[PDB]
Every structure is written in C-alpha cells, then in structure tokens.
PDB file of C-alpha atoms and ligand atoms in Angstrom:
ATOM      1  CA  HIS A   1     -61.550  -7.080 -28.935  1.00 53.21           C
ATOM      2  CA  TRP A   2     -63.583 -10.261 -29.522  1.00 53.02           C
ATOM      3  CA  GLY A   3     -63.941 -13.084 -27.025  1.00 51.30           C
ATOM      4  CA  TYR A   4     -66.351 -15.600 -25.516  1.00 50.36           C
ATOM      5  CA  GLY A   5     -67.562 -13.519 -22.584  1.00 50.62           C
ATOM      6  CA  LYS A   6     -70.905 -11.832 -22.005  1.00 48.79           C
ATOM      7  CA  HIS A   7     -69.827  -8.516 -23.508  1.00 48.86           C
ATOM      8  CA  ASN A   8     -67.599  -9.621 -26.392  1.00 51.73           C
ATOM      9  CA  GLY A   9     -68.882 -13.104 -27.193  1.00 51.64           C
ATOM     10  CA  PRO A  10     -70.428 -14.707 -30.344  1.00 54.06           C
ATOM     11  CA  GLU A  11     -73.611 -12.641 -29.966  1.00 58.66           C
ATOM     12  CA  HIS A  12     -71.517  -9.489 -30.490  1.00 56.00           C
ATOM     13  CA  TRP A  13     -69.213 -10.610 -33.347  1.00 60.29           C
ATOM     14  CA  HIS A  14     -71.529  -9.502 -36.175  1.00 59.49           C
ATOM     15  CA  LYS A  15     -70.890  -5.855 -35.298  1.00 59.78           C
ATOM     16  CA  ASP A  16     -67.244  -5.789 -36.369  1.00 58.94           C
ATOM     17  CA  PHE A  17     -67.598  -8.826 -38.627  1.00 59.75           C
ATOM     18  CA  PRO A  18     -71.003  -8.651 -40.394  1.00 61.23           C
ATOM     19  CA  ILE A  19     -70.235 -11.840 -42.319  1.00 62.98           C
ATOM     20  CA  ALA A  20     -71.204 -13.439 -38.974  1.00 64.85           C
ATOM     21  CA  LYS A  21     -74.788 -13.518 -40.267  1.00 62.99           C
ATOM     22  CA  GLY A  22     -73.578 -14.678 -43.662  1.00 60.05           C
ATOM     23  CA  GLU A  23     -74.592 -17.313 -46.194  1.00 57.34           C
ATOM     24  CA  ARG A  24     -72.322 -20.157 -45.013  1.00 52.58           C
ATOM     25  CA  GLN A  25     -71.359 -19.763 -41.355  1.00 52.83           C
ATOM     26  CA  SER A  26     -70.045 -22.455 -39.022  1.00 52.48           C
ATOM     27  CA  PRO A  27     -70.488 -24.425 -36.891  1.00 49.85           C
ATOM     28  CA  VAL A  28     -73.874 -26.023 -37.538  1.00 44.91           C
ATOM     29  CA  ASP A  29     -75.908 -28.834 -36.014  1.00 45.31           C
ATOM     30  CA  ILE A  30     -75.549 -32.093 -37.931  1.00 45.20           C
ATOM     31  CA  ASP A  31     -79.023 -33.591 -38.221  1.00 45.66           C
ATOM     32  CA  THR A  32     -77.909 -37.157 -38.904  1.00 47.85           C
ATOM     33  CA  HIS A  33     -81.281 -38.025 -40.448  1.00 45.35           C
ATOM     34  CA  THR A  34     -81.151 -35.188 -42.974  1.00 47.45           C
ATOM     35  CA  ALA A  35     -77.585 -35.712 -44.217  1.00 45.54           C
ATOM     36  CA  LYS A  36     -77.427 -37.382 -47.633  1.00 48.53           C
ATOM     37  CA  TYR A  37     -75.251 -40.428 -48.249  1.00 47.66           C
ATOM     38  CA  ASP A  38     -73.023 -39.514 -51.187  1.00 45.15           C
ATOM     39  CA  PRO A  39     -71.524 -42.573 -52.924  1.00 43.03           C
ATOM     40  CA  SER A  40     -69.716 -40.181 -55.274  1.00 41.42           C
ATOM     41  CA  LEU A  41     -67.323 -39.258 -52.456  1.00 40.85           C
ATOM     42  CA  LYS A  42     -63.879 -40.874 -52.580  1.00 43.31           C
ATOM     43  CA  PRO A  43     -62.020 -42.251 -49.557  1.00 45.02           C
ATOM     44  CA  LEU A  44     -60.567 -39.597 -47.242  1.00 45.59           C
ATOM     45  CA  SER A  45     -56.757 -39.552 -47.373  1.00 46.30           C
ATOM     46  CA  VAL A  46     -54.855 -38.420 -44.287  1.00 47.02           C
ATOM     47  CA  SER A  47     -51.116 -38.398 -44.977  1.00 43.87           C
ATOM     48  CA  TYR A  48     -49.415 -37.134 -41.827  1.00 43.33           C
ATOM     49  CA  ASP A  49     -46.386 -39.375 -42.297  1.00 41.05           C
ATOM     50  CA  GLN A  50     -43.882 -36.516 -42.667  1.00 43.27           C
ATOM     51  CA  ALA A  51     -45.639 -34.032 -40.376  1.00 43.80           C
ATOM     52  CA  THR A  52     -43.217 -31.623 -38.716  1.00 41.10           C
ATOM     53  CA  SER A  53     -44.541 -29.853 -35.629  1.00 44.81           C
ATOM     54  CA  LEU A  54     -42.738 -26.693 -34.560  1.00 47.92           C
ATOM     55  CA  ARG A  55     -44.371 -24.827 -31.715  1.00 47.42           C
ATOM     56  CA  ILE A  56     -47.369 -24.580 -29.391  1.00 47.13           C
ATOM     57  CA  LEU A  57     -48.873 -21.192 -28.565  1.00 47.18           C
ATOM     58  CA  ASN A  58     -51.580 -19.712 -26.366  1.00 46.78           C
ATOM     59  CA  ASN A  59     -53.149 -16.959 -28.483  1.00 47.42           C
ATOM     60  CA  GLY A  60     -55.702 -15.881 -25.904  1.00 47.83           C
ATOM     61  CA  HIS A  61     -58.626 -17.765 -27.462  1.00 44.17           C
ATOM     62  CA  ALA A  62     -57.191 -21.291 -27.492  1.00 45.44           C
ATOM     63  CA  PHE A  63     -53.797 -22.862 -28.181  1.00 44.30           C
ATOM     64  CA  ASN A  64     -52.316 -23.767 -31.562  1.00 45.70           C
ATOM     65  CA  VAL A  65     -49.798 -26.476 -32.416  1.00 44.34           C
ATOM     66  CA  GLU A  66     -48.202 -25.115 -35.597  1.00 46.02           C
ATOM     67  CA  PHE A  67     -46.634 -27.210 -38.351  1.00 44.14           C
ATOM     68  CA  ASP A  68     -44.011 -26.558 -41.011  1.00 42.70           C
ATOM     69  CA  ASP A  69     -46.074 -26.166 -44.177  1.00 43.38           C
ATOM     70  CA  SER A  70     -43.283 -25.093 -46.543  1.00 45.64           C
ATOM     71  CA  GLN A  71     -43.643 -28.413 -48.379  1.00 42.37           C
ATOM     72  CA  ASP A  72     -46.203 -31.191 -48.808  1.00 41.01           C
ATOM     73  CA  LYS A  73     -45.179 -33.072 -45.645  1.00 38.71           C
ATOM     74  CA  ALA A  74     -48.573 -33.469 -43.973  1.00 36.26           C
ATOM     75  CA  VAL A  75     -51.551 -33.313 -46.320  1.00 37.24           C
ATOM     76  CA  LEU A  76     -55.240 -34.088 -46.546  1.00 37.35           C
ATOM     77  CA  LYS A  77     -56.796 -35.256 -49.817  1.00 37.85           C
ATOM     78  CA  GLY A  78     -59.732 -37.193 -51.210  1.00 32.96           C
ATOM     79  CA  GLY A  79     -63.252 -37.217 -49.848  1.00 32.52           C
ATOM     80  CA  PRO A  80     -64.992 -34.036 -51.071  1.00 36.33           C
ATOM     81  CA  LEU A  81     -61.623 -32.362 -51.643  1.00 30.56           C
ATOM     82  CA  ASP A  82     -60.120 -31.516 -55.010  1.00 26.65           C
ATOM     83  CA  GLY A  83     -56.364 -31.164 -54.884  1.00 28.01           C
ATOM     84  CA  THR A  84     -53.957 -31.151 -51.958  1.00 27.49           C
ATOM     85  CA  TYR A  85     -54.423 -29.416 -48.615  1.00 27.86           C
ATOM     86  CA  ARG A  86     -51.440 -28.902 -46.286  1.00 28.58           C
ATOM     87  CA  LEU A  87     -51.746 -29.118 -42.503  1.00 27.82           C
ATOM     88  CA  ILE A  88     -50.801 -25.767 -40.946  1.00 27.65           C
ATOM     89  CA  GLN A  89     -52.096 -26.069 -37.373  1.00 24.29           C
ATOM     90  CA  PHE A  90     -54.521 -27.744 -34.998  1.00 20.05           C
ATOM     91  CA  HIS A  91     -56.310 -26.491 -31.894  1.00 16.12           C
ATOM     92  CA  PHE A  92     -59.257 -27.338 -29.659  1.00 14.86           C
ATOM     93  CA  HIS A  93     -62.508 -25.817 -28.393  1.00 13.50           C
ATOM     94  CA  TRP A  94     -63.741 -27.038 -25.002  1.00 17.37           C
ATOM     95  CA  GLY A  95     -66.164 -26.400 -22.189  1.00 13.79           C
ATOM     96  CA  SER A  96     -66.320 -25.693 -18.476  1.00 13.55           C
ATOM     97  CA  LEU A  97     -68.286 -28.931 -18.003  1.00 14.18           C
ATOM     98  CA  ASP A  98     -68.242 -32.277 -19.861  1.00 15.15           C
ATOM     99  CA  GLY A  99     -71.706 -31.683 -21.320  1.00 17.00           C
ATOM    100  CA  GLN A 100     -70.611 -28.781 -23.528  1.00 18.74           C
ATOM    101  CA  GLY A 101     -67.576 -27.610 -25.475  1.00 18.01           C
ATOM    102  CA  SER A 102     -67.878 -28.733 -29.093  1.00 17.70           C
ATOM    103  CA  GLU A 103     -68.811 -26.279 -31.808  1.00 19.34           C
ATOM    104  CA  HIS A 104     -70.585 -28.617 -34.183  1.00 18.66           C
ATOM    105  CA  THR A 105     -73.328 -30.699 -32.617  1.00 19.92           C
ATOM    106  CA  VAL A 106     -74.778 -34.045 -33.693  1.00 20.43           C
ATOM    107  CA  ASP A 107     -78.565 -34.165 -33.428  1.00 21.70           C
ATOM    108  CA  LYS A 108     -78.172 -31.300 -30.954  1.00 20.52           C
ATOM    109  CA  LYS A 109     -75.784 -33.325 -28.799  1.00 20.22           C
ATOM    110  CA  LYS A 110     -72.832 -31.281 -27.543  1.00 19.86           C
ATOM    111  CA  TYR A 111     -69.506 -33.031 -26.911  1.00 17.43           C
ATOM    112  CA  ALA A 112     -66.922 -32.161 -24.246  1.00 17.64           C
ATOM    113  CA  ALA A 113     -64.543 -30.709 -26.821  1.00 15.63           C
ATOM    114  CA  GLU A 114     -63.704 -30.515 -30.505  1.00 15.80           C
ATOM    115  CA  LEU A 115     -60.354 -30.827 -32.257  1.00 13.22           C
ATOM    116  CA  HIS A 116     -59.742 -28.831 -35.432  1.00 18.25           C
ATOM    117  CA  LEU A 117     -56.953 -29.807 -37.824  1.00 17.56           C
ATOM    118  CA  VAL A 118     -56.572 -26.886 -40.250  1.00 15.39           C
ATOM    119  CA  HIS A 119     -55.351 -27.415 -43.833  1.00 17.16           C
ATOM    120  CA  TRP A 120     -55.009 -25.026 -46.785  1.00 15.69           C
ATOM    121  CA  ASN A 121     -55.348 -25.602 -50.534  1.00 15.99           C
ATOM    122  CA  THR A 122     -51.825 -25.551 -52.008  1.00 15.98           C
ATOM    123  CA  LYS A 123     -53.122 -24.242 -55.350  1.00 15.58           C
ATOM    124  CA  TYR A 124     -53.306 -20.833 -53.666  1.00 13.94           C
ATOM    125  CA  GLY A 125     -49.632 -20.549 -52.678  1.00 14.36           C
ATOM    126  CA  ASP A 126     -50.073 -19.575 -49.021  1.00 16.49           C
ATOM    127  CA  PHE A 127     -52.547 -19.630 -46.113  1.00 16.95           C
ATOM    128  CA  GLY A 128     -53.227 -15.904 -46.341  1.00 19.37           C
ATOM    129  CA  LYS A 129     -54.337 -16.214 -49.973  1.00 18.47           C
ATOM    130  CA  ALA A 130     -56.244 -19.410 -49.284  1.00 17.71           C
ATOM    131  CA  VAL A 131     -58.618 -17.850 -46.725  1.00 18.15           C
ATOM    132  CA  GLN A 132     -59.850 -15.516 -49.476  1.00 16.95           C
ATOM    133  CA  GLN A 133     -61.165 -18.433 -51.576  1.00 16.92           C
ATOM    134  CA  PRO A 134     -64.425 -20.453 -51.278  1.00 19.22           C
ATOM    135  CA  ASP A 135     -62.404 -23.688 -51.285  1.00 17.50           C
ATOM    136  CA  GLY A 136     -59.273 -22.347 -49.640  1.00 19.53           C
ATOM    137  CA  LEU A 137     -59.360 -24.376 -46.438  1.00 17.78           C
ATOM    138  CA  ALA A 138     -60.260 -27.851 -45.279  1.00 18.69           C
ATOM    139  CA  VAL A 139     -60.735 -28.355 -41.558  1.00 20.17           C
ATOM    140  CA  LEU A 140     -60.978 -31.844 -40.105  1.00 20.43           C
ATOM    141  CA  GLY A 141     -63.168 -31.774 -37.013  1.00 18.76           C
ATOM    142  CA  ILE A 142     -62.979 -34.485 -34.374  1.00 19.78           C
ATOM    143  CA  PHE A 143     -65.251 -34.735 -31.318  1.00 20.01           C
ATOM    144  CA  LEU A 144     -63.884 -35.525 -27.852  1.00 19.91           C
ATOM    145  CA  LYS A 145     -65.926 -37.354 -25.203  1.00 21.48           C
ATOM    146  CA  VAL A 146     -64.747 -37.965 -21.635  1.00 22.40           C
ATOM    147  CA  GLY A 147     -63.768 -41.520 -20.769  1.00 24.83           C
ATOM    148  CA  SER A 148     -60.411 -43.279 -21.004  1.00 28.67           C
ATOM    149  CA  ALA A 149     -57.234 -41.275 -21.669  1.00 31.98           C
ATOM    150  CA  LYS A 150     -55.932 -40.624 -25.181  1.00 34.67           C
ATOM    151  CA  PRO A 151     -52.210 -41.556 -25.198  1.00 33.90           C
ATOM    152  CA  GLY A 152     -51.397 -39.429 -28.222  1.00 33.61           C
ATOM    153  CA  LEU A 153     -52.819 -36.344 -26.511  1.00 35.60           C
ATOM    154  CA  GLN A 154     -50.764 -36.548 -23.309  1.00 37.75           C
ATOM    155  CA  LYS A 155     -47.686 -34.893 -24.836  1.00 40.77           C
ATOM    156  CA  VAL A 156     -49.870 -31.848 -25.480  1.00 38.61           C
ATOM    157  CA  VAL A 157     -51.450 -31.948 -22.032  1.00 39.22           C
ATOM    158  CA  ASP A 158     -48.070 -32.060 -20.282  1.00 40.24           C
ATOM    159  CA  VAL A 159     -46.774 -28.901 -21.966  1.00 40.20           C
ATOM    160  CA  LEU A 160     -49.837 -26.768 -21.177  1.00 39.90           C
ATOM    161  CA  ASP A 161     -48.233 -25.567 -17.933  1.00 39.17           C
ATOM    162  CA  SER A 162     -45.559 -23.759 -19.944  1.00 37.21           C
ATOM    163  CA  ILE A 163     -48.100 -21.780 -22.004  1.00 39.37           C
ATOM    164  CA  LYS A 164     -50.641 -20.946 -19.308  1.00 36.98           C
ATOM    165  CA  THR A 165     -51.181 -17.333 -20.393  1.00 37.26           C
ATOM    166  CA  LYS A 166     -51.904 -15.346 -23.549  1.00 40.30           C
ATOM    167  CA  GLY A 167     -48.841 -14.797 -25.721  1.00 38.48           C
ATOM    168  CA  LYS A 168     -46.744 -17.639 -24.325  1.00 36.67           C
ATOM    169  CA  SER A 169     -45.287 -20.274 -26.644  1.00 34.66           C
ATOM    170  CA  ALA A 170     -43.080 -23.346 -26.254  1.00 33.72           C
ATOM    171  CA  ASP A 171     -41.070 -25.527 -28.616  1.00 32.77           C
ATOM    172  CA  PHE A 172     -43.159 -28.521 -29.650  1.00 30.57           C
ATOM    173  CA  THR A 173     -41.141 -30.459 -32.198  1.00 29.01           C
ATOM    174  CA  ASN A 174     -41.644 -34.087 -33.150  1.00 32.55           C
ATOM    175  CA  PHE A 175     -45.358 -34.297 -32.363  1.00 32.71           C
ATOM    176  CA  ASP A 176     -47.350 -36.875 -34.330  1.00 30.37           C
ATOM    177  CA  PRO A 177     -50.901 -35.714 -35.147  1.00 27.63           C
ATOM    178  CA  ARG A 178     -51.816 -39.264 -36.214  1.00 26.84           C
ATOM    179  CA  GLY A 179     -52.154 -40.092 -32.535  1.00 25.39           C
ATOM    180  CA  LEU A 180     -55.273 -37.929 -32.251  1.00 24.01           C
ATOM    181  CA  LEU A 181     -57.342 -39.742 -34.889  1.00 21.90           C
ATOM    182  CA  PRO A 182     -60.175 -42.193 -34.141  1.00 22.22           C
ATOM    183  CA  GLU A 183     -60.245 -45.634 -35.795  1.00 20.28           C
ATOM    184  CA  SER A 184     -62.860 -44.787 -38.445  1.00 18.08           C
ATOM    185  CA  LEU A 185     -62.651 -42.035 -41.050  1.00 18.19           C
ATOM    186  CA  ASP A 186     -66.403 -41.922 -41.779  1.00 16.62           C
ATOM    187  CA  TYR A 187     -67.503 -38.291 -41.904  1.00 18.44           C
ATOM    188  CA  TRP A 188     -70.049 -35.587 -42.704  1.00 17.45           C
ATOM    189  CA  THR A 189     -69.110 -32.657 -44.928  1.00 17.89           C
ATOM    190  CA  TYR A 190     -70.528 -29.239 -45.824  1.00 19.37           C
ATOM    191  CA  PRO A 191     -69.296 -25.811 -47.010  1.00 19.77           C
ATOM    192  CA  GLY A 192     -68.748 -23.355 -44.177  1.00 20.53           C
ATOM    193  CA  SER A 193     -66.493 -20.805 -42.482  1.00 22.28           C
ATOM    194  CA  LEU A 194     -63.927 -20.199 -39.745  1.00 24.90           C
ATOM    195  CA  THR A 195     -65.661 -20.417 -36.361  1.00 23.96           C
ATOM    196  CA  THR A 196     -63.829 -17.367 -34.995  1.00 22.15           C
ATOM    197  CA  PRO A 197     -63.452 -13.810 -36.330  1.00 22.80           C
ATOM    198  CA  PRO A 198     -62.839 -12.938 -39.150  1.00 24.59           C
ATOM    199  CA  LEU A 199     -65.344 -15.788 -39.762  1.00 26.46           C
ATOM    200  CA  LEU A 200     -64.236 -16.077 -43.404  1.00 25.96           C
ATOM    201  CA  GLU A 201     -66.380 -18.399 -45.537  1.00 24.31           C
ATOM    202  CA  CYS A 202     -63.499 -20.375 -46.993  1.00 21.90           C
ATOM    203  CA  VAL A 203     -63.916 -23.768 -45.369  1.00 22.25           C
ATOM    204  CA  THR A 204     -64.859 -27.234 -46.493  1.00 22.94           C
ATOM    205  CA  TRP A 205     -65.693 -28.880 -43.187  1.00 20.75           C
ATOM    206  CA  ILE A 206     -65.006 -32.567 -42.695  1.00 21.95           C
ATOM    207  CA  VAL A 207     -66.469 -33.776 -39.393  1.00 22.05           C
ATOM    208  CA  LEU A 208     -65.664 -37.325 -38.283  1.00 21.12           C
ATOM    209  CA  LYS A 209     -68.515 -39.481 -37.039  1.00 19.24           C
ATOM    210  CA  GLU A 210     -66.456 -41.347 -34.454  1.00 20.47           C
ATOM    211  CA  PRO A 211     -65.288 -39.298 -31.453  1.00 14.73           C
ATOM    212  CA  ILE A 212     -62.060 -39.923 -29.566  1.00 15.17           C
ATOM    213  CA  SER A 213     -61.973 -40.483 -25.812  1.00 15.12           C
ATOM    214  CA  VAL A 214     -59.942 -38.350 -23.413  1.00 12.96           C
ATOM    215  CA  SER A 215     -59.784 -38.689 -19.636  1.00 14.40           C
ATOM    216  CA  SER A 216     -61.302 -36.369 -17.054  1.00 11.87           C
ATOM    217  CA  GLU A 217     -57.754 -35.577 -15.918  1.00 11.71           C
ATOM    218  CA  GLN A 218     -56.714 -34.589 -19.453  1.00 17.28           C
ATOM    219  CA  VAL A 219     -59.615 -32.183 -20.060  1.00 16.59           C
ATOM    220  CA  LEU A 220     -59.133 -30.754 -16.569  1.00 16.63           C
ATOM    221  CA  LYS A 221     -55.695 -29.522 -17.604  1.00 17.86           C
ATOM    222  CA  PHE A 222     -57.177 -27.774 -20.666  1.00 16.25           C
ATOM    223  CA  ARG A 223     -59.450 -25.852 -18.268  1.00 17.06           C
ATOM    224  CA  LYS A 224     -56.447 -24.605 -16.278  1.00 12.92           C
ATOM    225  CA  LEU A 225     -55.285 -22.446 -19.193  1.00  9.07           C
ATOM    226  CA  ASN A 226     -55.883 -18.676 -19.104  1.00 11.12           C
ATOM    227  CA  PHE A 227     -57.541 -16.267 -21.551  1.00 10.17           C
ATOM    228  CA  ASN A 228     -55.564 -13.464 -19.890  1.00  9.77           C
ATOM    229  CA  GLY A 229     -51.910 -12.570 -20.219  1.00  7.93           C
ATOM    230  CA  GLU A 230     -49.322 -12.988 -17.459  1.00  5.10           C
ATOM    231  CA  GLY A 231     -49.716 -10.627 -14.518  1.00  7.43           C
ATOM    232  CA  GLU A 232     -53.421 -10.031 -15.167  1.00  9.44           C
ATOM    233  CA  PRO A 233     -56.512 -11.161 -13.204  1.00 10.77           C
ATOM    234  CA  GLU A 234     -57.153 -14.837 -13.956  1.00  9.95           C
ATOM    235  CA  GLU A 235     -59.817 -15.820 -16.471  1.00  9.17           C
ATOM    236  CA  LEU A 236     -59.887 -19.559 -17.023  1.00  7.24           C
ATOM    237  CA  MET A 237     -59.882 -20.520 -20.702  1.00  5.58           C
ATOM    238  CA  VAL A 238     -63.179 -22.415 -20.873  1.00  6.52           C
ATOM    239  CA  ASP A 239     -66.196 -22.485 -23.175  1.00  2.74           C
ATOM    240  CA  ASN A 240     -64.235 -21.080 -26.113  1.00  3.24           C
ATOM    241  CA  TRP A 241     -66.800 -22.388 -28.592  1.00  2.00           C
ATOM    242  CA  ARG A 242     -69.230 -20.678 -30.968  1.00  4.10           C
ATOM    243  CA  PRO A 243     -72.775 -22.078 -30.894  1.00  4.39           C
ATOM    244  CA  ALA A 244     -74.426 -23.702 -33.919  1.00  7.88           C
ATOM    245  CA  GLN A 245     -75.456 -21.360 -36.733  1.00  9.50           C
ATOM    246  CA  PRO A 246     -78.366 -21.615 -39.219  1.00  9.47           C
ATOM    247  CA  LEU A 247     -77.739 -24.183 -41.966  1.00 10.76           C
ATOM    248  CA  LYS A 248     -79.682 -22.033 -44.425  1.00 15.16           C
ATOM    249  CA  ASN A 249     -79.293 -22.983 -48.093  1.00 16.75           C
ATOM    250  CA  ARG A 250     -76.760 -25.774 -47.563  1.00 19.56           C
ATOM    251  CA  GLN A 251     -76.764 -29.564 -47.573  1.00 19.11           C
ATOM    252  CA  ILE A 252     -74.732 -31.895 -45.379  1.00 19.28           C
ATOM    253  CA  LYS A 253     -73.315 -34.954 -47.112  1.00 21.54           C
ATOM    254  CA  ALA A 254     -72.364 -38.213 -45.419  1.00 22.85           C
ATOM    255  CA  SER A 255     -69.592 -40.602 -46.481  1.00 22.41           C
ATOM    256  CA  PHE A 256     -71.456 -43.507 -44.884  1.00 24.89           C
ATOM    257  CA  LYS A 257     -74.949 -44.964 -44.459  1.00 26.47           C
TER     258      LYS A 257
HETATM  259 ZN1   ZN B   1     -61.497 -24.236 -34.325  1.00 27.58          ZN
END
C-alpha cells in the first residue's frame, strides 16, 4: 500500500487518495513574515493533568502512544479552537539525518523531527466521526532539534526496542505527555489535513514556535525502528515525513508578534 519509498511515497498518494491535491492539504511551509498576528486569539490551554496513556504501537509508518479518551482527561482548548478536543494519540515524523525530518517547515527550514499530539472535537462523539468534519481534529505540532537530551522523552526511547517491527505493541501506562512540551506556547495556526493517507481535511493545525531539544543518542534510537514486520528484510524507519504542500487559498495566523 502507501509508504515513504520511491515507488509508494508522497508523490504517488494522489492516485488512491485524490484529496492529496486538495484545497487544504498539510504540511505547509510557515513563512514567518507572511503570518498575521491575531490578537483575537485566546491563550492556548493544554490540560494533560489526568492523561492516561495505555499502549505504544509500531504501525509500519511510525509509532503511536495511545491514550484513554473515554472521558475528558487530557484536553486541548482555547487558541483558535472552539470547544473541547480530547487527546487520543501522539507520534513523530523524523529523518535519516539531522537536517531533515519535520513535515512543516519554518521559512523553509527543516527540523530533525516533528511531534504530533492528536486531539478530536468531543462535539462529534468519537474520533471516526470527527475526521469527517472540517473542525474535527486539532493537532499540536512540536519541532525537535538535536542538542541536549529531553528527559521526558527517554521513557519512550527506552521502550522502542520492544516494538522494533510493524505490528508490535507494548504496554505504556503512566506516561506524562506534559514532559514533551517546550517552555513557550506561542504558535502558528491554519486549517489543514492529516499528513498521511487518507489525508482527510479535518485538521486545525497548531504549530509551536519553540522547538524542544533531543539528544543525538535519542534520535538515533528512533532510526533503529523498522518499517517492515518481523522476519522480513530490514527497512529502517526513517524519513517518514510528507514534504510541504501548496498553501493555496489559506492564511497562517500567529499568536505572537
Ligand atoms: Zn503526524
């Protein structure tokens, strides 16, 4: 099916998923000098106090840390968002080298990786219904640059050996997502889509200005993961990012000056 290789990568996705050349596709390049400061935006509210992590899984494209979203235990509100959005999962996109890996880019600059915290609008009852709405999802994007280690990320790094191949999953209870956030919550926001098939245009993207730092050793372990399933020829899980798409008829708003 779809992938990130030469014969099934982003350049090929539009064939089975024509929305790939749609009206509001993601990611996009954030031209910092074109974004409009919007004083009408309210403060961003990240309430991960009662977040309950359950499991970590390698789905063949990346790995997801899933959360219990049966109640409002970990939610995102405020900013450009109307209503409450529940955290359902988070995952990363990274490169084979430190100079690439992020999906969104800032003034064309590519970061080593990008963290995506996925939330869905509770007014729609469930995730499956939410992805069918223009304001169904809110994804918080955080850039990762290589430098000093991120303490809150180590617990994830250490369990990657147990989910090396496609299909594998491990228990991952009691993980605190708050440990992955940078100091500042300043951000850029625009209407977009999922960055992987089915590329549904149901996302309000919230991209933080301040990146977090991870160590060379930490990212190296991400690159040891496999796209393939157990007992198959090894394909390192690297460069699982979609390149920037045309902004088209959209405007990027900034929460800061
Ligand atoms: Zn993502």
